[PDB]
Each structure stands twice: as structure tokens, then as C-alpha cells.
């Protein structure tokens, strides 16, 4: 019931398939990265959309208190927005065990740690 | 009188001095990067501050129409805010002639093109 928790469980399998995979990095185009990450939380009834460099979240069921706790700007329990970079940092938190995460408006780059 | 124009004129000299400079990359900690970039526009009376993952701009003199044109959310001609990533992309536009620009909450990395 915390939608951000769904990221600790979803593999980087998503990002592997969608990205360009090298020995020591994976590069994922931004729209494909965001599409995959948005789809993860769609199962708790949380809808996500990008407009500009902001991510907008809204939910019919689940409260978004976890997103607010992590920095999102919410108008109520069911509607929040947050910068693209904050969204990327949140959803890749578990991937940081194995990868440096960096990005720009074009793409997300995960570099194997070492 | 367009404050974003001041970036086309300010060298990467700033970033070299503040960063860790290697043969094919420069890595600049975020607070030092933003401090240098904020200082650039301070000369047209534009004040800049980071809070969360947002950059807040306000000006006593110069209008901020150029920032608005580039995506900033403005309450009037003299007050705007924009996501950190959008700010980074804007201020490094001229550096993109020589460098890939990428970043995260920790630091900005410029990789020599080639
Ligand atoms: Cl954990
Ligand atoms: Cl857009
Ligand atoms: Cl130009
Ligand atoms: Cl802060």
C-alpha cells in the first residue's frame, strides 16, 4: 500500500530490456525509462505523467504520503508533483546497490559500481 | 539584459577550478556547481537559491522572461522557479559544444565529447 515500496521489489530487469546494455553500463532513453517506472505503480492505482521536467502523480485508491515524505509537492493525499530528477533518484534507490545512477533530459545511465 | 545570455559568455573556467579535472571528464560537486552558476547571474541583480530539487530565482531589476521562455514557472516577471535538472541543462548549453553533460543529486559530470 506504499507505492514507492514497489520499486524495492521490481527488478532492473525492466531497465535491462529497455536499455542498451554494455559490460559496465546500461543507458536507457528517458521516455522508455519513465514509461517502465510509471507502469510499476500503475498496479496500486497510481497514475503518473511527465510534463516539462515535472512528474505528476494521482491516485484513486492509494494515498501518496510516502512520495510526500520523500519530497513531493502534494495538494492532497491523492495528488502530487515532483521534479524529474527527484523521481529518478527515488525509483532507482535499490539499483544504487549495484550502479552509479546519472542522467540528463535525454537518458538515464547506470554505471556498474567498482 | 537577458540573464540566461550571461552563460554563453562565462567560461567553463569556473567549473574547471571547482571540479575534479581528468583527461576526459570534469566532476563538480552539486553545491559548488550551483554556487558558481548562481554567482554568474548575480551581476544582473538576479538572486538564485536551491531548496529541495527546485531552483528559485528573483530579481530586483532584470525581467525573467528568458527563463520563463525556457520552461521556468513564474508568478510574475521577477520571480520564477524551475527544477534543478532544467536549470543545469540551461546553464550548460554552451558547454555542450565540448562535453556530454550528466548529473545526479550529488554532482555534475562533464565528459569530453568523442
Ligand atoms: Cl531497504
Ligand atoms: Cl513534455
Ligand atoms: Cl548560440
Ligand atoms: Cl535543500
Short mmCIF file of C-alpha atoms and ligand atoms in Angstrom, two decimals:
data_model
loop_
_atom_site.label_atom_id
_atom_site.label_comp_id
_atom_site.label_asym_id
_atom_site.label_seq_id
_atom_site.Cartn_x
_atom_site.Cartn_y
_atom_site.Cartn_z
CA UNK A 1 0.00 0.00 0.00
CA UNK A 2 3.03 2.38 -0.11
CA UNK A 3 3.54 2.69 -3.86
CA UNK A 4 7.22 3.72 -3.59
CA UNK A 5 7.83 0.34 -1.93
CA UNK A 6 7.01 -1.36 -5.24
CA UNK A 7 10.35 -0.19 -6.53
CA UNK A 8 12.33 -2.27 -3.95
CA UNK A 9 10.70 -5.34 -5.48
CA UNK A 10 10.78 -4.58 -9.22
CA UNK A 11 13.98 -5.80 -10.83
CA UNK A 12 16.32 -3.86 -13.05
CA UNK A 13 15.01 -6.46 -15.48
CA UNK A 14 12.80 -3.67 -16.80
CA UNK A 15 15.74 -1.37 -17.49
CA UNK A 16 17.90 -4.11 -18.99
CA UNK A 17 15.27 -4.93 -21.58
CA UNK A 18 14.56 -1.31 -22.47
CA UNK A 19 18.13 -0.05 -22.36
CA UNK A 20 21.32 -0.53 -24.27
CA UNK A 21 23.27 -2.96 -22.11
CA UNK A 22 27.11 -2.91 -22.05
CA UNK A 23 29.60 -4.70 -19.82
CA UNK A 24 29.82 -1.84 -17.38
CA UNK A 25 26.80 0.39 -18.12
CA UNK A 26 23.17 0.49 -19.18
CA UNK A 27 21.80 3.54 -20.99
CA UNK A 28 18.00 3.95 -21.13
CA UNK A 29 16.28 6.67 -23.20
CA UNK A 30 14.23 8.90 -20.91
CA UNK A 31 10.80 8.17 -22.30
CA UNK A 32 11.32 4.39 -22.11
CA UNK A 33 12.81 4.69 -18.61
CA UNK A 34 9.83 6.74 -17.36
CA UNK A 35 7.27 4.52 -19.12
CA UNK A 36 8.66 1.45 -17.33
CA UNK A 37 8.84 3.17 -13.97
CA UNK A 38 5.34 4.65 -14.35
CA UNK A 39 3.94 1.23 -15.19
CA UNK A 40 5.30 -0.22 -11.90
CA UNK A 41 2.98 1.81 -9.70
CA UNK A 42 0.01 1.63 -12.03
CA UNK A 43 -0.88 -1.59 -10.15
CA UNK A 44 -1.67 0.30 -6.95
CA UNK A 45 -3.93 2.63 -8.98
CA UNK A 46 -1.30 5.41 -9.10
CA UNK A 47 -1.21 7.26 -12.41
CA UNK A 48 1.97 9.06 -13.49
CA UNK A 49 2.72 11.52 -16.26
CA UNK A 50 5.59 13.77 -17.27
CA UNK A 51 5.02 17.35 -18.37
CA UNK A 52 8.02 19.61 -18.72
CA UNK A 53 10.59 18.45 -16.18
CA UNK A 54 7.94 17.60 -13.62
CA UNK A 55 6.30 14.27 -12.82
CA UNK A 56 2.59 14.39 -11.83
CA UNK A 57 1.10 11.58 -9.72
CA UNK A 58 -2.58 10.97 -8.93
CA UNK A 59 -4.34 8.05 -7.32
CA UNK A 60 -7.89 6.82 -6.99
CA UNK A 61 -7.03 4.38 -4.17
CA UNK A 62 -3.64 4.59 -2.51
CA UNK A 63 -2.55 7.69 -0.52
CA UNK A 64 0.70 9.30 -1.65
CA UNK A 65 2.14 10.02 1.83
CA UNK A 66 5.35 8.18 1.02
CA UNK A 67 6.02 10.40 -2.02
CA UNK A 68 5.33 13.49 0.08
CA UNK A 69 7.68 12.21 2.77
CA UNK A 70 10.38 11.88 0.08
CA UNK A 71 9.93 15.44 -1.11
CA UNK A 72 6.94 15.56 -3.47
CA UNK A 73 4.67 18.62 -3.50
CA UNK A 74 1.13 17.42 -2.81
CA UNK A 75 -2.16 19.31 -2.96
CA UNK A 76 -3.86 16.49 -1.04
CA UNK A 77 -3.29 12.81 -0.19
CA UNK A 78 -4.06 11.79 -3.78
CA UNK A 79 -2.27 14.33 -5.98
CA UNK A 80 1.46 15.21 -6.00
CA UNK A 81 4.12 16.50 -8.34
CA UNK A 82 7.89 16.29 -8.13
CA UNK A 83 10.87 17.16 -10.31
CA UNK A 84 12.03 14.57 -12.77
CA UNK A 85 15.40 14.24 -11.01
CA UNK A 86 13.75 13.55 -7.65
CA UNK A 87 11.55 10.89 -9.26
CA UNK A 88 14.61 9.22 -10.86
CA UNK A 89 16.54 9.21 -7.56
CA UNK A 90 13.59 7.66 -5.70
CA UNK A 91 12.79 4.90 -8.12
CA UNK A 92 16.42 3.82 -8.61
CA UNK A 93 17.27 3.72 -4.88
CA UNK A 94 17.58 -0.05 -4.79
CA UNK A 95 19.53 -0.13 -8.09
CA UNK A 96 22.16 2.01 -6.38
CA UNK A 97 23.37 -1.16 -4.64
CA UNK A 98 24.97 -2.17 -7.96
CA UNK A 99 25.06 1.01 -10.04
CA UNK A 100 26.02 4.67 -10.06
CA UNK A 101 22.94 6.45 -11.36
CA UNK A 102 23.24 9.57 -13.51
CA UNK A 103 21.02 11.26 -16.05
CA UNK A 104 20.09 14.19 -18.24
CA UNK A 105 16.99 15.20 -20.27
CA UNK A 106 17.92 12.58 -22.89
CA UNK A 107 18.63 9.41 -20.95
CA UNK A 108 19.42 7.60 -17.73
CA UNK A 109 22.85 5.97 -17.41
CA UNK A 110 23.58 3.26 -14.85
CA UNK A 111 27.30 2.54 -14.42
CA UNK A 112 28.32 -0.70 -12.71
CA UNK A 113 29.93 0.08 -9.36
CA UNK A 114 33.66 -0.70 -8.97
CA UNK B 1 19.70 42.27 -20.00
CA UNK B 2 18.67 38.60 -20.63
CA UNK B 3 20.35 36.89 -17.68
CA UNK B 4 20.46 33.44 -19.34
CA UNK B 5 22.65 35.03 -22.02
CA UNK B 6 25.39 35.50 -19.42
CA UNK B 7 26.02 31.79 -19.59
CA UNK B 8 27.11 31.91 -23.30
CA UNK B 9 29.89 34.24 -22.19
CA UNK B 10 31.06 32.68 -18.91
CA UNK B 11 33.78 30.10 -19.47
CA UNK B 12 33.92 26.58 -18.16
CA UNK B 13 36.85 28.15 -16.32
CA UNK B 14 34.51 28.27 -13.35
CA UNK B 15 33.80 24.54 -13.47
CA UNK B 16 37.42 23.58 -14.09
CA UNK B 17 38.55 25.36 -10.95
CA UNK B 18 35.76 23.98 -8.78
CA UNK B 19 35.72 20.46 -10.18
CA UNK B 20 37.97 17.46 -10.27
CA UNK B 21 39.53 17.64 -13.72
CA UNK B 22 40.60 14.45 -15.58
CA UNK B 23 41.75 13.91 -19.15
CA UNK B 24 38.29 13.13 -20.39
CA UNK B 25 35.90 14.36 -17.67
CA UNK B 26 35.25 17.00 -15.04
CA UNK B 27 33.18 16.15 -11.97
CA UNK B 28 31.79 19.06 -9.92
CA UNK B 29 30.01 18.58 -6.56
CA UNK B 30 26.47 19.93 -6.81
CA UNK B 31 26.72 22.69 -4.24
CA UNK B 32 29.91 24.10 -5.80
CA UNK B 33 28.44 23.79 -9.30
CA UNK B 34 25.27 25.67 -8.30
CA UNK B 35 27.19 28.30 -6.30
CA UNK B 36 29.30 29.14 -9.37
CA UNK B 37 26.33 29.21 -11.71
CA UNK B 38 24.25 31.29 -9.28
CA UNK B 39 27.07 33.80 -8.97
CA UNK B 40 27.11 34.36 -12.76
CA UNK B 41 23.69 35.99 -12.86
CA UNK B 42 24.07 37.83 -9.58
CA UNK B 43 25.58 40.65 -11.69
CA UNK B 44 22.26 41.40 -13.38
CA UNK B 45 20.64 41.55 -9.92
CA UNK B 46 19.16 38.03 -10.23
CA UNK B 47 19.23 36.08 -6.97
CA UNK B 48 19.19 32.27 -7.05
CA UNK B 49 18.69 29.65 -4.37
CA UNK B 50 18.15 25.91 -4.21
CA UNK B 51 15.54 24.37 -1.95
CA UNK B 52 14.71 20.71 -2.40
CA UNK B 53 15.23 19.90 -6.07
CA UNK B 54 13.94 23.27 -7.18
CA UNK B 55 15.83 26.44 -8.08
CA UNK B 56 14.17 29.76 -7.09
CA UNK B 57 15.05 32.96 -8.97
CA UNK B 58 14.10 36.54 -8.06
CA UNK B 59 15.23 39.85 -9.45
CA UNK B 60 15.04 43.48 -8.41
CA UNK B 61 15.98 44.77 -11.89
CA UNK B 62 16.01 42.36 -14.81
CA UNK B 63 12.82 40.61 -16.02
CA UNK B 64 12.98 36.82 -16.14
CA UNK B 65 11.16 36.34 -19.48
CA UNK B 66 14.02 34.30 -20.90
CA UNK B 67 13.82 31.78 -18.03
CA UNK B 68 10.06 31.54 -18.49
CA UNK B 69 10.54 31.01 -22.22
CA UNK B 70 12.88 28.11 -21.39
CA UNK B 71 10.37 26.45 -19.11
CA UNK B 72 10.51 28.15 -15.70
CA UNK B 73 7.32 28.59 -13.67
CA UNK B 74 6.93 32.29 -12.92
CA UNK B 75 4.47 34.09 -10.66
CA UNK B 76 5.39 37.40 -12.29
CA UNK B 77 8.20 38.92 -14.39
CA UNK B 78 10.53 38.94 -11.37
CA UNK B 79 10.00 35.60 -9.62
CA UNK B 80 10.38 32.09 -11.11
CA UNK B 81 11.20 28.57 -10.06
CA UNK B 82 12.40 25.60 -12.09
CA UNK B 83 13.59 22.06 -11.43
CA UNK B 84 17.25 21.56 -10.75
CA UNK B 85 17.68 19.46 -13.90
CA UNK B 86 16.17 22.17 -16.10
CA UNK B 87 18.49 24.76 -14.54
CA UNK B 88 21.54 22.52 -15.18
CA UNK B 89 20.55 21.93 -18.83
CA UNK B 90 20.07 25.67 -19.42
CA UNK B 91 23.28 26.90 -17.89
CA UNK B 92 25.47 24.24 -19.54
CA UNK B 93 24.03 24.72 -23.05
CA UNK B 94 27.21 26.27 -24.42
CA UNK B 95 29.41 23.68 -22.65
CA UNK B 96 27.61 21.01 -24.66
CA UNK B 97 29.76 22.02 -27.64
CA UNK B 98 32.65 20.16 -25.97
CA UNK B 99 31.03 17.96 -23.32
CA UNK B 100 28.29 15.45 -22.65
CA UNK B 101 26.53 16.77 -19.57
CA UNK B 102 25.05 14.40 -16.99
CA UNK B 103 24.20 14.68 -13.32
CA UNK B 104 22.55 13.40 -10.18
CA UNK B 105 21.76 14.88 -6.72
CA UNK B 106 25.45 14.54 -5.80
CA UNK B 107 27.36 16.03 -8.71
CA UNK B 108 27.57 17.21 -12.29
CA UNK B 109 29.78 15.23 -14.68
CA UNK B 110 31.02 16.68 -17.97
CA UNK B 111 32.51 14.06 -20.31
CA UNK B 112 34.68 15.26 -23.19
CA UNK B 113 32.91 14.58 -26.48
CA UNK B 114 34.48 11.97 -28.82
CL1 LIG C 1 15.85 -1.18 2.12
CL1 LIG C 2 6.79 17.44 -22.05
CL1 LIG C 3 24.35 30.33 -29.65
CL1 LIG C 4 17.73 21.74 0.27
#
